[PDB]
C-alpha cells in the first residue's frame, strides 16, 4: 500500500460527477447557480465522511462549509479543467464547459478563475496533493473570535498538513519536497485574494438578481445572504501558511 490510508480514503469519498443541468448571460449564470446548488449539497455530504470534520461542533462545521463554499467550487473547477481539458477551458461540469467564445462581458472573473488550472498544469499537481489541499481549503478561514472547537480544528489542520507532506513525498529530496510544499501552500494563500473578487461579484449579482433575471437556488442563497456580506467586510480571519 504505497498510497497512504488517509489519501486513499479521501479518494473514495470524492464526489461523483455533477451536472449543471444545462445561451444568454442570465441563462448561463442561472445554470452556474444551479451547478452551485448541487456543488454545495455535494460538499456537505462529502464533509460527513471527511475524517475529523464531524467531531467539530456543528456550528463550526456549518461555518466552515459556508466560508469555503466558493473557494472549494473554484478549486474543484481548477482540477476538472486541468484533468479534462489540460487547463485550456473552464470545465464547470460535463454539460457546461466554457472557452473564450462563451464569455462576453464576467469574462474578467472567468480569466482570474482560469489562473488556478494554469497553476495546476504548471506545477503538475497530483491527485494526492489536490485532495489534501482541498481539505486545507475547507479549513482555511475561521471567525475573528475563533471556533468553538478550536483545539479540534487545529489538530485536524495539522493532520492534513502532515498528509499533504506525505502526498508530496510520494513523488524525493528534502530541498525539492520543501520547495514544493511552499509552492502548493502559497497557491492556497493566493486563493484568498482571488475568491474575494468572486465573492463580491456573487453578492452584487445576488442583489440585482431580479433585474438581471438570474435565479439563485435556496441553499446557496442562504450562504450568500448569511455570510458573504460579513466575509467581504473582513469580519473573518483568513489563515495563511506564509506571512
Residues forming the annotated binding site for progesterone?
80
Interface of this chain with ligand WOW, residues 206 to 225, rule: CB under 6 A: 206, 214
Stretch that binds ligand WOW, among 60-68, 106-114, 139-147, 177-185 (CB under 6 A): 106-114
Among 201, 219, 236, 239, binds ligand WOW (CB under 6 A): 201
Return the C-alpha cell found at 52.
Answer: 475529523
Nearer to ligand WOW, 68 or 180 (CB): 68
Rounded to an integer, what is the distance from CA 46 to the centroid of its chain? 13
Stretch that binds ligand WOW, among 33-41, 46-54, 127-135, 164-172 (CB under 6 A): 33-41
Q: Should residue 109 be labelled a site residue for ligand WOW when binding is judged by CB under 6 A? A: yes
Q: Should residue 13 be labelled a site residue for ligand WOW when binding is judged by CB under 6 A? A: no
Among 41, 198, 232, 236, binds ligand WOW (CB under 6 A): 198
Q: Does residue 30 contact residue 216 with C-beta atoms inside 8 Å?
A: no
230 closest CA partner among 62, 63, 74, 41: 63
| CA dihedral angle for residue 96, residue 87, residue 126, residue 77, rounded to 10 degrees | -30
Return the C-alpha cell found at 99.
Answer: 472557452
Among 56, 73, 131, 132, binds ligand WOW (CB under 6 A): 73
Among 74, 116, 125, 133, binds ligand WOW (CB under 6 A): 74
Stretch that binds ligand WOW, among 68-76, 129-137, 153-161, 184-192 (CB under 6 A): 68-76
Rg of the chain over Cα atoms, rounded to whole angstroms, equals 18
Nearer to ligand WOW, 154 or 215 (CB): 215
- The C-alpha atoms of residue 94 and residue 99 are separated, in whole angstroms, by 13
- Which DSSP letter does residue 55 get? G
Q: Should residue 115 be labelled a site residue for ligand WOW when binding is judged by CB under 6 A? A: no
181 closest CA partner among 154, 160, 153, 150: 160
Q: At what angle do helices 127-138 and 69-85 cross, to 10 degrees?
A: 170
Among 110, 123, 161, 236, binds ligand WOW (CB under 6 A): 110
Locus of grid cell 519536497: 177
Q: Should residue 35 be labelled a site residue for ligand WOW when binding is judged by CB under 6 A? A: yes
Helix, strand, coil percentages (3-state) for the chain, rounded to 5, are 70, 5, 25
Q: Is the torsion defined by CA of 172, 178, 183, 187 positive or negative?
A: positive
Among 205, 217, 219, 239, binds ligand WOW (CB under 6 A): 205
| Partner residues linked to 93 by β-bridges | 96
Nearest approach, Cβ of 98 to ligand WOW (angstroms)? 8
Q: Should residue 40 be labelled a site residue for ligand WOW when binding is judged by CB under 6 A? A: no
Footprint of ligand WOW (CB under 6 A): 29, 32-33, 35-36, 39, 73-74, 76-77, 92, 106, 109-110, 198, 201-202, 205-206, 214
Amino acid at each position: 500500500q504505497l498510497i497512504p490510508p488517509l489519501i486513499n480514503l479521501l479518494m473514495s469519498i470524492e464526489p461523483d460527477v455533477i451536472y449543471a443541468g444545462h445561451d444568454t448571460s442570465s441563462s448561463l449564470l442561472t445554470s452556474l447557480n444551479q451547478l452551485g446548488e448541487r456543488q454545495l449539497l455535494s460538499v456537505v455530504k462529502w464533509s460527513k465522511s471527511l475524517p475529523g470534520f464531524r467531531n467539530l461542533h456543528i456550528d463550526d462545521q456549518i461555518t466552515l462549509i459556508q466560508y469555503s463554499w466558493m473557494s472549494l467550487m473554484v478549486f474543484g473547477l481548477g482540477w476538472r479543467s486541468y484533468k479534462h481539458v489540460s487547463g485550456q477551458m473552464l470545465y464547470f461540469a460535463p454539460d457546461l464547459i466554457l472557452n473564450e467564445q462563451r464569455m462576453k462581458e464576467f469574462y474578467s472573473l472567468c480569466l482570474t478563475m482560469w489562473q488556478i488550472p494554469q497553476e495546476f498544469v504548471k506545477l503538475q499537481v497530483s491527485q494526492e496533493e489536490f485532495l489534501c489541499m482541498k481539505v486545507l481549503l475547507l479549513l482555511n478561514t475561521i471567525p475573528l473570535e475563533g471556533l468553538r472547537s478550536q483545539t479540534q480544528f487545529e489538530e485536524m489542520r495539522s493532520s492534513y498538513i502532515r498528509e499533504l507532506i506525505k502526498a508530496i513525498g510520494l513523488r524525493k529530496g528534502v530541498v525539492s519536497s520543501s520547495q514544493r510544499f511552499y509552492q502548493l501552500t502559497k497557491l492556497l494563500d493566493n486563493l484568498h485574494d482571488l475568491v474575494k473578487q468572486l465573492h463580491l461579484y456573487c453578492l452584487n449579482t445576488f442583489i440585482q438578481s431580479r433585474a438581471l433575471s438570474v435565479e439563485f437556488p435556496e441553499m446557496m442563497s442562504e450562504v450568500i445572504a448569511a455570510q458573504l456580506p460579513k466575509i467581504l467586510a473582513g469580519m473573518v480571519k483568513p489563515l495563511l501558511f506564509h506571512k
